[PDB]
Amino acid sequence: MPKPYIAINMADLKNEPKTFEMFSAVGPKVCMVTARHPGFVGFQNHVQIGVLPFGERFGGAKMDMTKESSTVRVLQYTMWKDWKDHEEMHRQNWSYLFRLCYSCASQMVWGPWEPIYEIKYADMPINTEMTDFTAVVGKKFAEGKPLEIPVISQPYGKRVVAFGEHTVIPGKEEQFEDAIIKTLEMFKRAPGFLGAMLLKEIGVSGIGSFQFGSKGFHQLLESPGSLEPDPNNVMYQAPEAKPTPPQYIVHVEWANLDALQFGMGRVLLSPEYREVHDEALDTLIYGPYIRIINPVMEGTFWREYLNE
Amino acid sequence: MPKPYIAINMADLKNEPKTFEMFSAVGPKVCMVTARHPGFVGFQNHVQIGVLPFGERFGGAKMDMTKESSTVRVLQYTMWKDWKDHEEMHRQNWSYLFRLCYSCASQMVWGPWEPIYEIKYADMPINTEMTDFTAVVGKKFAEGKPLEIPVISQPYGKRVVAFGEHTVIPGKEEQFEDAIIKTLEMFKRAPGFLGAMLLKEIGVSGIGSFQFGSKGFHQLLESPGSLEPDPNNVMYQAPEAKPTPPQYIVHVEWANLDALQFGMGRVLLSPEYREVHDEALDTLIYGPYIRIINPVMEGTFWREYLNE
Amino acid sequence: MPKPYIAINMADLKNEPKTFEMFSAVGPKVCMVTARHPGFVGFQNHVQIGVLPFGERFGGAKMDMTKESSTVRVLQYTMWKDWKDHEEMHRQNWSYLFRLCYSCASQMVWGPWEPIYEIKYADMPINTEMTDFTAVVGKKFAEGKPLEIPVISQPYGKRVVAFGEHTVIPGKEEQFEDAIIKTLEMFKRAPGFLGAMLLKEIGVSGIGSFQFGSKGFHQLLESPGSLEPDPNNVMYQAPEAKPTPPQYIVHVEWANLDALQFGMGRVLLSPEYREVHDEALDTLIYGPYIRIINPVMEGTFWREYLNE
Numbered sequence: 001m002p003k004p005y006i007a008i009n010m011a012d013l014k015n016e017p018k019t020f021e022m023f024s025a026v027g028p029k030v031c032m033v034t035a036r037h038p039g040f041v042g043f044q045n046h047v048q049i050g051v052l053p054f055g056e057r058f059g060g061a062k063m064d065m066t067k068e069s070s071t072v073r074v075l076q077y078t079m080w081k082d083w084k085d086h087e088e089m090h091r092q093n094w095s096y097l098f099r100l101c102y103s104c105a106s107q108m109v110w111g112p113w114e115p116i117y118e119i120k121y122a123d124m125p126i127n128t129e130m131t132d133f134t135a136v137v138g139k140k141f142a143e144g145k146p147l148e149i150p151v152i153s154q155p156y157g158k159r160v161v162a163f164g165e166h167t168v169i170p171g172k173e174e175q176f177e178d179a180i181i182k183t184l185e186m187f188k189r190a191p192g193f194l195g196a197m198l199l200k201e202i203g204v205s206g207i208g209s210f211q212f213g214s215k216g217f218h219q220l221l222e223s224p225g226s227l228e229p230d231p232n233n234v235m236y237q238a239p240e241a242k243p244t245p246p247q248y249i250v251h252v253e254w255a256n257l258d259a260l261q262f263g264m265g266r267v268l269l270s271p272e273y274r275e276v277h278d279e280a281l282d283t284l285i286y287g288p289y290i291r292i293i294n295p296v297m298e299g300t301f302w303r304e305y306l307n308e
Numbered sequence: 309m310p311k312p313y314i315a316i317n318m319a320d321l322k323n324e325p326k327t328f329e330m331f332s333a334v335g336p337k338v339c340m341v342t343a344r345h346p347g348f349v350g351f352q353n354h355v356q357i358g359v360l361p362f363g364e365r366f367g368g369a370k371m372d373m374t375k376e377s378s379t380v381r382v383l384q385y386t387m388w389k390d391w392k393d394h395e396e397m398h399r400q401n402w403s404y405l406f407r408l409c410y411s412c413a414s415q416m417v418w419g420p421w422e423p424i425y426e427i428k429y430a431d432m433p434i435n436t437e438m439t440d441f442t443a444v445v446g447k448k449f450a451e452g453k454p455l456e457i458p459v460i461s462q463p464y465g466k467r468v469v470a471f472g473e474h475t476v477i478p479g480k481e482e483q484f485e486d487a488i489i490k491t492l493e494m495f496k497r498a499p500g501f502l503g504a505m506l507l508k509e510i511g512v513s514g515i516g517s518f519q520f521g522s523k524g525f526h527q528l529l530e531s532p533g534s535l536e537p538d539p540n541n542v543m544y545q546a547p548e549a550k551p552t553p554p555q556y557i558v559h560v561e562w563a564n565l566d567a568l569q570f571g572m573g574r575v576l577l578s579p580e581y582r583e584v585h586d587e588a589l590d591t592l593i594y595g596p597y598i599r600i601i602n603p604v605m606e607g608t609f610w611r612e613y614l615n616e
Numbered sequence: 617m618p619k620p621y622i623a624i625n626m627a628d629l630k631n632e633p634k635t636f637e638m639f640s641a642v643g644p645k646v647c648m649v650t651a652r653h654p655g656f657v658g659f660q661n662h663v664q665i666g667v668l669p670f671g672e673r674f675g676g677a678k679m680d681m682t683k684e685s686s687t688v689r690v691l692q693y694t695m696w697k698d699w700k701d702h703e704e705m706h707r708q709n710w711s712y713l714f715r716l717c718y719s720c721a722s723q724m725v726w727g728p729w730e731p732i733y734e735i736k737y738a739d740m741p742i743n744t745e746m747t748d749f750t751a752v753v754g755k756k757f758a759e760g761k762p763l764e765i766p767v768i769s770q771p772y773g774k775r776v777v778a779f780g781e782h783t784v785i786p787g788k789e790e791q792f793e794d795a796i797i798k799t800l801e802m803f804k805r806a807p808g809f810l811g812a813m814l815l816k817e818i819g820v821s822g823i824g825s826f827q828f829g830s831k832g833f834h835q836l837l838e839s840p841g842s843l844e845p846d847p848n849n850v851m852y853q854a855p856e857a858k859p860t861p862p863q864y865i866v867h868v869e870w871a872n873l874d875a876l877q878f879g880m881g882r883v884l885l886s887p888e889y890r891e892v893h894d895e896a897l898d899t900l901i902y903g904p905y906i907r908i909i910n911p912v913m914e915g916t917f918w919r920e921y922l923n924e
C-alpha cells in the first residue's frame with residue numbers, strides 16, 4: 001500500500017492572537033523535530049473553524065464560527081509507517097518536544113490528547129495546486145493512465161474537511177464500517193469531493209497527551225519550561241487505552257463549505273444515499289458530530305506514501 | 309443507605325442571554341416533568357464557570373471564565389432510586405420532555421450527552437442556609453447527636469464544586485478508588501470543605517443523549533418542535549455503553565473558589581496528602597481535568613434520601 | 617508540640633499587573649516544589665498592603681497603600697520540622713526552584729532575602745471558614761472540650777496581619793520576650809484577635825537569598841534562565857548570619873484593619889496594657905515598625921502541626 005498509522009493531537013486554546021503567534025513560531029519547530037525519525041512520513045494540521053448544524057439540531061453552531069468562538073481546537077495529524085515509531089520519536093526527542101509544547105501552556109484550555117488511529121478505508125489523492133494540473137494531465141496521458149488523473153485537492157488551507165465523530169455499539173462494528181465505506185464511495189458522485197477515509201482508534205499516546213504517573217504529573221505542574229518530566233514515567237501503553245465502545249472518525253474532504261454541506265447532506269437528501277447510510281446510523285452510540293476543520297499546514301507527501 | 313443512581317446531562321450552549329432566558333423558562337418545566345416518576349429523588353443542576361489551571365498547565369484557563377467564554381456547559385444531575393427509573397421517565401414522558409429540550413436547539417453547540425453513574429463513595433451533607441444553623445444546632449443537641457451537626461453547605465448557587473474527570477487504566481480500578489476515597493476523607497481537615505463523592509460511569513442513556521437509530525435520527529433532524537422521534541428507536545441499552553477504560557468523576561464541594569483551590573491543592577502542597585494521592589495518579593489514562601461548576605438550581609432533598 | 621521553624625522570603629517587586637500575573641503562574645509551582653521534602657509542613661504567603669502609622673509618626677503611610685504604592689513586598693512563610701530541612705530542599709530542588717524564581721527577575725527591585733526564625737511563643741488557631749463553625753462546635757462538645765473551640769480565623773485573604781519589626785539591645789533579650797509574650801496574652805481580651813507569635817531570627821538562608829560566592833554571583837548575573845548557579849557555592853551557613861543585636865518579629869493576626877488598629881493600639885490606650893508593654897519598649901534598638909500584611913495563599917495545615 002501502505003496505509004500509514006495516524007496520531008491526532010487535540011487541544012483547545014485561547015482564540016486570541018498570542019495563540020496564533022505561538023503557532024507561527026513553534027508549530028514549525030515541533031514538526032521539524034518530528035521529522036528526525038524515519039518512520040515519520042508526513043502530516044496534516046487542522047484548525048477547527050466550525051460545526052455542521054444539521055438544520056438546527058445544533059442551533060448555536062455554524063460552519064464558520066471563527067469570528068465568535070473564544071477558544072480554538074487544533075487537530076494535528078502525524079503519519080507513521082508504524083505507530084510504535086510515533087511513541088519512539090516522542091521518547092527520543094523529549095527534551096526538545098516537551099520544552100516546545102510547553103511554551104504554549106499559557107494558552108492551553110484543554111489537551112493535549114493524542115489518540116492513535118489505523119485506517120480502515122482511504123481514498124485520498126495527491127495534493128496539487130491549480131498551477132500543476134497541466135503537467136499532471138500531461139504526464140498521465142504520456143503513460144496512458146487517464147484514470148489516474150485526480151480532482152484538484154488544493155494544499156495549505158484551500159479546502160475544507162468534515163471531521164465526523166462516531167462511537168459504535170459493541171458487536172455492530174462490521175455493519176458500520178461496511179455502510180460508511182460504501183457511503184464514502186458514493187460520495188465520489190458529489191461535486192467538490194476531494195477524498196475521504198475511515199479512521200479507527202486503537203489506543204492513546206499517553207506521552208503525547210502529557211499523561212504520566214504520579215511523578216511525571218508533578219514535574220509537569222512544577223515545570224519552569226526548561227526541564228522535562230521523566231518520559232519513562234508513562235504508566236500505560238498506547239493499546240491499553242483502546243476504547244470500548246469502538247471509536248471512529250469519518251474524515252471527508254470537500255472543495256468548499258457548500259460542497260461539504262450539500263455533498264454530505266446527500267445521505268439526508270438523496271434516497272439512494274440515505275438508505276445505505278441509515279445502516280451506519282443503526283449501530284451508533286455517539287454521533288455523528290461533525291466538526292468543520294481547515295488543513296492549514298501540511299506535508300502533502302504523506303499522501304505519496306499512502307499511494308505507493 | 310441509600311446511594312441513589314446519578315444521571316448527568318451535559319451540553320454546550322451559546323453563552324449569550326437568549327440561552328439563560330430559555331434556561332429560566334424551560335429548566336423548571338423539565339424538572340417538573342422528571343418529578344412525575346416516583347424513582348426521582350432530587351437533582352443538582354450546575355453551570356460550568358471555569359477550569360482549575362494547576363499553575364499554568366492550563367494557561368488560557370481560570371476558575372472564573374464566565375466573562376470571556378463564548379459557550380457555556382451545563383451539568384444536570386438527576387438522582388434515582390434505580391437508574392432504570394430514569395430511562396422509564398424519559399420514555400413515559402417523551403412528548404413533553406422532547407418538545408421541551410428542543411426549544412433550546414437554537415442554542416445548542418454540542419450535546420445532549422447523559423451518562424449514568426453509580427456512587428462508590430459519598431460524604432454529602434444536607435444543605436442549610438445561614439438562617440437554619442441555630443435550629444440545626446438546637447435539634448441535634450436535643451437528641452444528644454452533636455456529631456451529626458454538619459458544616460453549612462449553602463444551596464442555590466452559594467458554593468462551588470470541583471468536577472474532576474478521570475479515566476483509569478484497566479486493572480488499576482481498585483488502587484484508584486482506594487486512594488481517591490482516602491483523599492476525600494483527608495479533605496475533611498481542609499477549611500471550606502462541604503463534601504464529596506466518587507462517581508463511576510456504568511453506561512449512557514441513549515434516549516437522553518438523543519441517540520436513536522437511523523429512523524429517530526431523521527425525525528430528530530426533521531423535527532418542527534411539535535413531534536417526537538420514536539423513543540423505542542433507541543438501539544442500545546445504557547450498560548452496553550459502559551466504557552473501557554473505566555471513567556470516574558471526583559465531585560468535591562467547597563465554600564469558595566479559594567477554599568477549593570487551596571483545599572484540593574493540598575494533594576500538591578501537603579506531603580501527607582501528596583503521598584496518598586500519588587497512587588491515584590499512577591493509575592490514570594486521562595486526568596485529572598478539573599472543571600469548576602456552580603450548583604445553581606437544585607432539589608436539595610435528594611440528599612435527604614442519600615442519608616436515610 | 618511541635619513549634620516548626622520558619623523561613624521568611626522577602627522581596628520587593630513592581631506593583632503592576634505583570635507581577636501579579638507571574639505570582640498566579642509560578643507561586644503555585646514553587647510551593648509544589650517545596651512540598652517535595654518531608655520536613656515541609658505548610659506555609660503562609662503574605663502581600664504587604666500597608667503600614668501602621670501610629671497617629672502621624674508615619675504620615676505618608678496608611679494601613680492600605682495598595683492604591684498608591686509603586687512596589688509591593690511579599691513575605692512568604694514556609695514551615696519546617698527542622699530549619700536544616702529548608703536548606704536541603706533548596707539544594708535538592710535547585711534547578712526547578714532557581715529557574716522558577718528567576719522568571720520573576722524582570723519584576724524584582726530588591727530581594728530575595730530569606731532569614732530563618734525560631735518561635736519563642738505561639739498562640740495560633742486552626743483556620744476555619746464561616747461554613748465550618750457548626751461542625752467545629754459540634755465535635756468539641758461531643759468530646760466535652762469547649763475550651764478547644766477557637767475564634768474563626770478565616771483562610772485565604774480574609775483576615776489581616778500586623779508584622780512588627782524589633783531589634784533588641786544586647787543583654788535585654790529576656791525583658792523584651794517576657795513583656796511581649798505577656799502582651800500577646802492580654803491581646804486575647806481584644807475583639808477580632810485571631811492569634812499571634814513571637815519570632816526570633818537565628819540566621820539567614822544564603823541560598824534562598826541568592827547569596828553565593830564570587831562564582832555563583834557571576835552565574836546569577838549571567839543567567840539566561842535555563843542554568844543555575846552552583847548551589848554549593850554558598851560561602852556561609854545559616855547561623856553564621858545570626859544578627860547581633862538580636863532581631864524579632866511580633867506577628868499578630870486580627871479580624872480586620874480596625875480590630876488590628878484598636879487592638880494593638882491597646883498598648884497605647886489601655887493603662888493596664890500600656891504599662892506591661894512599656895518594658896518591651898525599654899529594650900529596643902529599632903522598632904516597632906509595623907507592616908500590615910495579607911495572608912493571601914496558605915497551607916493552613918502547618919497549623920495542624922504546630923498544635924499536635
Ligand SMILES: [Fe+3]
Pocket residue numbers: 007009078086090114205208
Ligand atoms: Fe505526537
Ligand SMILES: [Fe+3]
Pocket residue numbers: 315317386394398422513516
Ligand atoms: Fe435525563
Ligand SMILES: [Fe+3]
Pocket residue numbers: 623625694702706730821824
Ligand atoms: Fe526558601
